[PDB]
Ligand binder design. Structure first.
Ligand SMILES: O=C(NCc1ccc(F)cc1F)c1c(O)c2c(CO)ccnc2n(O)c1=O
Ligand SMILES: O=C(NCc1ccc(F)cc1F)c1c(O)c2c(CO)ccnc2n(O)c1=O
Ligand SMILES: [Mg+2]
Ligand SMILES: [Mg+2]
Ligand SMILES: [Mg+2]
Ligand SMILES: [Mg+2]
Ligand SMILES: [Zn+2]
Ligand SMILES: [Zn+2]
Lengths: 182, 367, 367, 182
DNA sequence: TGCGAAATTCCATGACA
DNA sequence: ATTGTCATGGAATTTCGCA
DNA sequence: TGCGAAATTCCATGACA
DNA sequence: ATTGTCATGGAATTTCGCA
């Protein structure tokens, strides 16, 4: 069988609704199944329109062979199906109520939901400006299985922003109190 | 006067050939030369004569001498002519150069992607969705290009676009010309906060940004072809052109900017499938060798009458936007340091240190 | 399809080398080539494949082929690629030429003064006494120049100035570019009433008026030098510059425009006195021989990749003032007649006959 | 002695006052003593100002060594003297009431006064437009003494406007009647 | 009949929007 | 139905002054 | 071991305001 | 303290298919 490659499969999902940050409420998460590279796009709704608008930016850089998602409404619409067919993208859906991706993708999506929470506390309405530095952190995180960061697997080079200092990724006792109040 | 006195009686004076009869007529010392009879003016009058002949039409060496030779003769006339040309400030700053610049440098391609970005603005363009300009960001090593439409070539629009770009990776160095958007203190602070070194071209020398400028040509050429027979709605075409050019083969390289960046094509038409059986680690290994073996051009031969800068030499910087009927060259200045055969530091006409390209310099004539 | 059918069983077909194993897989005829396994599409599908590869970024020969070669192979692929390039209207009218024009002609100097005038306007200049433009009239044989300040590059101002000039002599031919002042029917009637033939440069080719254009440079250069450190009051300087340039030596000719016109200097500084003992008849005799022995340059060597026009060839005229994101070249047209190696008549894109210089032409690529 | 040459001596004089033609009343006549070449400049007065203004046009083409005139006020003024001294022109005046030039110049000035009269009749207020064609006629008139026209002696070439047809230069009987009425 | 230096010629360079 | 041109100053070449 | 033709490489040309 | 670049299509060169 052919070895797994970048752009073979993109895993997409929505995170939200979130506190409004400059008008945006959701984050469309795109993860490459082979490298673990992550793209974060802020949208104003989990709609096909906002999904096509954000994926048009991504597909102007690289086009995946397959897009995998759950049976979310924005992804099972006939409009999004026509959008994927025009670009030669095969849509692949997980079973309803049985979300299935891959171990590397599952853990990657875990890190994103946890990293977003750790920085949402204290600045719940400023996460729009933080999305760039969040992507850099996620894509420069060392992978214990592959022993390479997503940046290294996608570009074949080291990065100018290595993240040697790891955030606790767990909420400190003071961050838990300031979160239960929100 | 005393020198001309001993010449009339027949005594020899160095510079005046002996085989000619020097006589006096109408109170002026004359000589019978093959071209005719010429007046030999005293040494104290020769500077004023050269000046009056030059000032007629501010002519160069030969045209000024042909005037003087109609009436006068004295030893080494051109020596006195050239002496005045080098002192005439109007000629020094208005005349054109007749010496070409030395051959261009072909600086080494950046070794890795994101080692050096080149950025520049295209515009103004026909209004499309309210947008007039395009921010063009080219990775020096790969040629991979990002396009961002803006309403103005402003620092604010530049920062907003680069914050989106740097979501994927942070570059070591960003190179740009000295436009207002890139030289503002706001842009320098933005780059320092992210550990990005800002590199600037020498003023008024777009060749130094030739990486993007050349890419600007391909962007406009493709946009033109796609807009033939249609109204110039280019806003919706920028993502199309960005993808098309990033996946276009360079015939001399045998690779596309996308392949040099990722080592593998994505789900685009006619995607290359050669490395299909290799693993990603084997694929990246082959990519690391492809990047190091890329063709690199060499410096072309120098033209037959080129000049190279020397420390201490008198050079003149070209005037940026010369007004009508105004000199094209600044007053002479001195070369302080030679950074490379094509770039120098000069003591500017205002008293400052200035880093300029020799394409905007001429060597001051007549030393 | 039928051609590919006999290939799978092992029968030979011209163009397909025998030493390769042609097999079938997934309903497509494939071949094991050194670069890898490629799909051999049927003949009826190859035009559509070349079009889809080209249309990605409207790329030239090699860049379009490198795309197709990633997936397909068939005999003489570039032949089909070039066939599509020559039919793509967008590429033909947007791409640049890579063939330079043939070497320039050095037309013979007019034999006599007033045989041919060259005229052109300089401007707009800084307002001086209400005047903005300068009419420049250069005698082709002598280089003698008349200057006339005008408020507009208009036919009325041109006629008023030339009526004053023609008080001294009437020229055989007046050469000008195709500006509005010289192409108006009013100006043609003015010239016909006086027996003057009007000659026009090919459009958008100031080299054809290079006689005046070069003189325009000397006029501006002198005006600049005289106005250094002063406000640009150039109206009172036009007579000064006219006299100064008319009495300036040409170093290659060894004469001034005044001397070539009159055969004797007037009461100007440094006036030549060589012909002082000759009579006027002997002086004019010497002048008649000086005019015929003047240096004349020859056609330079052609560049290594130049093109010369041939009757019936497909050429394209450059667009005069191309708008933003619009093609730089008109649709292809046919050469009707070759007036000289640098000038042709074409069947214009509107249906008219047009006389153009090859500097504003490119030969249509791919025949 | 040195042979006579063009630009050796210019002979100047005023003709007028004339009927007003586009605001001008006088004609400053300049004749080169050697070639007989004639320049005609219309002025609004026989003043030094109008003389300097018209001679500045001529001296921007060629500068004579000597200018000869009568003791007219415009030519004996200190202003006109300063003007000539700046250009290196030597002023030379004829004796008062004893106008003296040369035979070729005397006859040339005769032709000008007669040719102006022949075309003044019928169109007395349109001579301004006719000054160009008048100069061409005068400068392309065959000289019986030198056997060359002024144009040929000044430029050393034949002219593109040879005047083979000679005007009678005398007033026809009908032109005399239409002149005695004016 | 040849030398060193001055004088002359050569010509690449650039600018005429 | 029309077409490049020429001032400029270092460099290359020729000429000059003298023997 | 060499031929004719196809394939590849070479590179002058021009345009990025 | 900084530096030209590269798509393009005929032409020149190399390689291919075959013997
Ligand atoms: O003249 C420009 N290009 C033309 C150009 C010329 C030669 C070359 F090899 C590449 C080129 F592109 C140009 C500018 O003059 C400019 C200025 C100054 O006005 C400020 C900011 N950007 C600028 N860009 O981007 C430009 O391209
Ligand atoms: O571009 C012009 N010159 C520039 C120029 C370029 C090359 C050259 F070898 C000589 C030159 F002078 C130019 C014009 O384009 C023009 C036009 C068209 O706009 C109409 C009327 N006159 C014009 N003159 O006089 C011009 O000089
Ligand atoms: Mg720029
Ligand atoms: Mg630019
Ligand atoms: Mg013009
Ligand atoms: Mg012009
Ligand atoms: Zn000067
Ligand atoms: Zn095309």
């Amino acid at each position: 069988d052919r070895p797994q490659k970048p752009f073979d499969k993109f895993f997409i999902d929505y995170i939200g609704p979130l506190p409004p940050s400059q008008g945006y409420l959701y984050v469309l998460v795109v993860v490459d199944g082979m490298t673990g590279f992550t793209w974060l796009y802020p949208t104003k709704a989990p709609s096909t329109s906002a999904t096509v608008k954000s994926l048009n930016v991504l597909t102007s850089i690289a086009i995946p062979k397959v897009i995998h998602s759950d049976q979310g409404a924005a992804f099972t619409s006939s409009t999004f199906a026509e959008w994927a067919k025009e670009r030669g993208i095969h849509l692949e859906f997980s079973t309803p109520y049985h979300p299935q991706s891959s171990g590397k993708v599952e853990r990657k999506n875990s890190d994103i939901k946890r990293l977003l929470t750790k920085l949402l506390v204290g600045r719940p309405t400023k996460w729009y400006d933080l999305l760039p530095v969040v992507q850099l952190a996620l894509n420069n995180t060392y992978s214990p299985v592959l022993k390479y960061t997503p940046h290294q697997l996608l570009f074949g080079i080291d990065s100018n922003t290595p993240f040697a200092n790891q955030d606790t990724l767990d909420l400190t006792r003071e961050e838990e109190l300031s979160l239960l109040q929100e | 006067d005393a020198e001309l006195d001993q010449l009339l009686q027949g005594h020899y004076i160095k510079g005046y050939p002996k085989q000619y009869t020097y006589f006096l007529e109408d109170g002026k010392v004359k000589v019978s030369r093959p071209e005719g009879v010429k007046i030999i003016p005293p040494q104290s009058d020769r500077q004023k004569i050269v000046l009056q002949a030059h000032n007629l039409a501010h002519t160069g060496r030969e045209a000024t001498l042909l005037k003087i030779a109609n009436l006068y003769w004295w030893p080494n006339m051109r020596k006195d002519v050239v002496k005045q040309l080098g002192r005439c400030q109007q000629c020094l700053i208005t005349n054109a150069s007749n010496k070409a610049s030395g051959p261009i440098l072909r600086p080494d391609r950046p070794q890795k992607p994101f080692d050096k970005f080149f950025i520049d603005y295209i515009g103004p363009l026909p209004p499309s969705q309210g947008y007039l300009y395009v921010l063009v960001v080219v990775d020096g090593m790969t040629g991979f290009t990002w396009l961002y439409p803006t309403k103005a070539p402003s620092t604010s629009a530049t920062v907003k676009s680069l914050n989106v770009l740097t979501s994927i990776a942070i570059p070591k160095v960003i190179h740009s010309d000295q436009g207002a958007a890139f030289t503002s203190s706001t842009f320098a602070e933005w780059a320092k906060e992210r550990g990005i070194h800002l590199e600037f071209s020498t003023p008024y020398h777009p060749q130094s940004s030739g990486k993007v400028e050349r890419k600007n040509s391909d962007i406009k050429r493709l946009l033109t072809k796609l807009l033939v027979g249609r109204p110039t709605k280019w806003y919706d075409l920028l993502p199309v052109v960005q993808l098309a050019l990033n996946n276009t083969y360079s015939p001399v390289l045998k690779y596309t900017p996308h392949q040099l960046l990722f080592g593998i094509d994505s789900n685009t038409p006619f995607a290359n499938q050669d490395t299909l059986d290799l693993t990603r680690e084997e694929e990246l290994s082959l990519l690391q060798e492809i990047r190091t073996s890329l063709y690199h051009p060499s410096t072309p031969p120098a033209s037959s009458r080129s000049w190279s800068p020397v420390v201490g030499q008198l050079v003149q910087e070209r005037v940026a936007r010369p007004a009508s009927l105004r000199p094209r060259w600044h007053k002479p200045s001195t070369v302080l340091k030679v950074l490379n055969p094509r770039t120098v530091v000069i003591l500017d006409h205002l008293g400052n240190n200035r880093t300029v390209s020799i394409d905007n310099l001429k060597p001051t004539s007549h030393q």
